[PDB]
Nucleic acid binder design. Structure first.
Ligand SMILES: [Zn+2]
Lengths: 317, 120, 53
RNA sequence: GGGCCACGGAAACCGCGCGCGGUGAUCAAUGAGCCGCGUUCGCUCCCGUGGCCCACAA
RNA sequence: GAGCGUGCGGUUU
C-alpha cells in the first residue's frame, strides 16, 4: 500500500544558524482569509453525476472566483478526491496531475469464480499494464470484500491509469468477464480522505457562513494552503536573503540553502520553501542533495514556476 | 440516530402515524417522495409531514424540519423508510410523506399534531 | 449505490456494519449537488443549529 | 540579450451525459416518462504583446 | 499550435 508520494525523506541541515524574520512573509496559518483563498487549494469530494469541469465551474460562480483548475479529470459517474487549485495557486496542479492516485472500485463478475482465483489473479495485475497505446503502473491491489459476484477492492496507480479498463482485463483473465459498477477516488498525490476532504454542500455553506454570517473558522478549514499541494515533493529550504531573489527569477545558488531533503537527484522536481515553510517556487534540481550540502557555490535549482509575490520579502540582494 | 431527527417518537405514536397515512391514501389526498413533499410544504397544503429516521445521506431530508417550522406545519418521524413507502401505495421505499387532506384521519392527525407540540 | 464506509474506521465495505469496528456504515458517495441549490437556505438553518449559535 | 510574472493562441449554433422548474409513475418517490430551461476546468512545452528583476544570498 | 489529466462529441468564416 505504498505510492511513491509516500517515500520517507530525511531532512539534512546545511546552515544551522539561519533564522527567519517574523515581519516578512505569511505562513499559511497567518494569512488573512482573503489571501488564504488567493493561495488556496480545495480537497474536494466530487459528487456523482457532473463532469469535473462543470463542478469547478459551479465553484467559480458561487465563490466568485476568476480562476480555478482541478487536477486529474474524474469521469462523470465517479466520486471522491478532486483537488481544486485556486486563483493564484492554480499552477500547483502541475505537482498533482503526475502524482499517483488511489481508487476503491466495485467490480461485477459476469460469472461465478471461487474467492481464491479472484485474489490470485488480481495479484497478477500489479506491475505494468498496457491500455489505449500506452503503458501505466499498478502499484498495489488490495481486495477488501467479495460478495458472490461482486468484488470490492482498493487500487493504487500511476497517473492516467484507466480502472474501468483494468477491471475489464481482470474479467478476461478470469474468463467470465467483468465490468466496473462503481468507482471512487480516495487519494490523489498528497490529497487523502481526512478532515480536509469537503463535499460541495459543506463548502458552499461554510462560504455563506463566512460571507453572510461572518464566521471564518469553517470556511478557512475548507481551503488548504498551497503548501499542501507540495507535501509529496522533495524540498529545499532557503535563507531569508535568498527569497526575494528567487521570486524575481533568480536560480537558487547553493549559498542560499538552509536545509534540504535527502536523496534529491539532478532533474528532480523540487519545491522551494522559506524557513517559515512557505512555498516560494517550484524548480528542477541541478545537483544531488549531497553536492548541494558540501559545495559552497553553484546553481542548485533552476527556478521554473514562482508562486510567492515579490513584495512579501525585501529585495535584500 | 440522525441529526435531522430533532426529537423522540414512541412506538405507539409512530405506529398511529403509519396508519394515519395509510388512510388518506384512499379517503383523501397524499403525496410521497421528498420532492412532492417539500413542494407541498412550500405551498402550505401539507397538514402533516411524516419523515423517516433512516435516510442516508441526511441532505435528502435535512431541510424538511426547518422548513416545516417556518410554515408552521407539524412534522413527525417513523422508524423506517421502507415501511413508509409501503404504507403510501407504492412498492419502493419513500423517504418522506405529506398529508394534503386528511379525509377520515382528521381526529387521528389532530391527535398526532397536538402531541408533537410537546416535544418542541 | 453500493459502496459504503465505516464512519469510525474509514473502512470501505458493502456491509451495513463495519467488519472491523462494528459501527453502522454509510454510503461512500457524497450527496448529489445542484447549482440551483433549491433548499440551500434551509439546509444552512439545520446546519447552523448543529455547529452552534 | 537571459530568468520570472501577467495577458493572448477563437466565437456562435447543436448533441450524448448531468442536472433545475412543472408533472408525478406497477420494484428508479434518494424520482419513470413527457415537456421546458439550464449546463464543461485547467496545467506543461512552444509562439507573440507587455511588465518586473538580473539577485552565488553577503 | 504539440502534449498531459480517464470525458467530451458534431456542425458552420
Ligand atoms: Zn476499519
Amino acid at each position: 500500500r505504498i505510492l511513491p508520494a509516500d517515500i520517507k525523506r530525511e531532512v539534512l541541515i546545511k546552515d544551522e544558524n539561519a533564522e527567519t524574520n517574523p515581519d516578512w512573509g505569511f505562513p499559511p496559518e497567518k494569512r488573512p482569509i482573503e489571501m488564504h483563498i488567493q493561495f488556496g487549494v480545495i480537497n474536494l469530494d466530487k459528487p456523482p453525476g457532473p463532469t469535473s469541469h462543470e463542478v469547478v465551474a459551479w465553484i467559480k460562480k458561487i465563490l466568485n472566483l476568476e480562476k480555478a483548475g482541478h487536477g486529474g479529470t474524474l469521469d462523470p459517474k465517479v466520486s471522491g478526491v478532486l483537488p481544486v487549485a485556486l486563483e493564484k495557486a492554480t499552477r500547483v496542479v502541475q505537482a498533482l496531475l503526475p502524482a499517483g492516485k488511489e481508487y476503491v472500485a466495485l467490480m461485477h463478475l459476469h460469472g461465478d469464480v471461487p474467492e481464491d482465483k479472484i485474489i490470485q489473479v488480481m495479484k497478477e495485475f500489479e506491475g505494468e499494464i498496457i491500455q489505449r497505446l500506452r503503458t501505466r503502473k499498478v502499484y498495489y491491489i488490495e481486495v477488501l470484500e467479495i460478495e458472490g459476484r461482486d468484488v470490492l477492492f482498493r487500487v493504487g496507480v500511476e497517473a492516467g491509469t484507466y480502472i474501468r479498463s483494468l477491471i475489464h482485463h481482470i474479467g478476461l483473465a478470469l474468463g467470465v468477464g467483468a465490468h466496473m459498477s462503481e468507482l471512487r477516488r480516495t487519494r490523489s498525490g498528497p490529497f487523502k480522505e481526512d478532515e480536509t476532504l469537503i463535499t460541495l454542500h459543506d463548502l458552499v455553506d461554510y462560504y455563506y457562513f463566512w460571507k453572510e454570517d461572518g464566521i471564518e473558522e469553517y470556511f478557512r478549514k475548507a481551503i488548504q494552503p498551497m503548501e499542501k499541494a507540495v507535501e509529496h515533493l522533495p524540498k529545499v529550504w532557503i535563507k531569508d536573503s535568498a527569497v526575494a531573489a528567487v521570486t524575481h527569477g533568480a536560480d537558487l545558488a547553493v549559498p542560499g540553502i538552509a536545509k534540504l531533503h535527502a536523496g534529491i537527484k539532478r532533474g528532480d522536481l523540487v519545491a522551494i520553501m522559506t524557513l517559515k515553510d512557505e512555498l516560494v517556487a517550484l524548480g528542477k534540481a541541478m545537483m544531488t542533495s549531497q553536492e548541494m550540502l558540501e559545495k559552497t557555490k553553484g546553481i542548485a535549482v533552476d527556478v521554473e514556476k514562482v508562486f510567492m509575490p515579490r513584495d512579501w520579502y525585501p529585495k535584500l540582494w | 440516530k440522525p441529526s435531522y431527527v430533532k426529537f423522540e417518537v414512541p412506538k405507539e405514536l409512530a405506529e398511529k402515524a403509519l396508519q394515519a397515512v395509510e388512510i388518506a391514501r384512499d379517503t383523501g389526498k397524499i403525496r410521497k417522495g421528498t420532492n412532492e413533499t417539500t413542494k407541498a410544504v412550500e405551498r402550505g397544503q401539507a397538514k402533516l409531514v411524516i419523515i423517516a429516521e433512516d435516510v442516508d445521506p441526511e441532505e435528502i431530508v435535512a431541510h424538511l424540519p426547518p422548513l416545516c417550522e417556518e410554515k408552521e406545519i407539524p412534522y413527525i418521524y417513523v422508524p423506517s423508510k421502507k415501511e413508509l413507502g409501503a404504507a403510501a401505495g407504492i412498492e419502493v421505499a419513500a423517504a418522506s410523506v405529506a398529508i394534503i387532506e386528511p379525509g377520515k384521519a382528521r381526529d387521528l392527525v389532530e391527535e398526532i399534531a397536538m402531541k408533537v407540540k410537546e416535544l418542541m | 449505490f453500493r459502496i459504503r464506509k465505516c464512519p469510525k474506521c474509514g473502512r470501505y465495505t458493502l456491509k451495513e456494519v463495519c467488519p472491523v469496528c462494528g459501527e453502522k456504515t454509510k454510503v461512500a458517495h457524497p450527496p448529489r449537488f445542484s447549482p440551483e441549490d433549491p433548499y440551500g437556505e434551509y439546509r444552512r438553518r439545520w446546519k447552523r443549529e448543529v455547529l452552534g449559535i
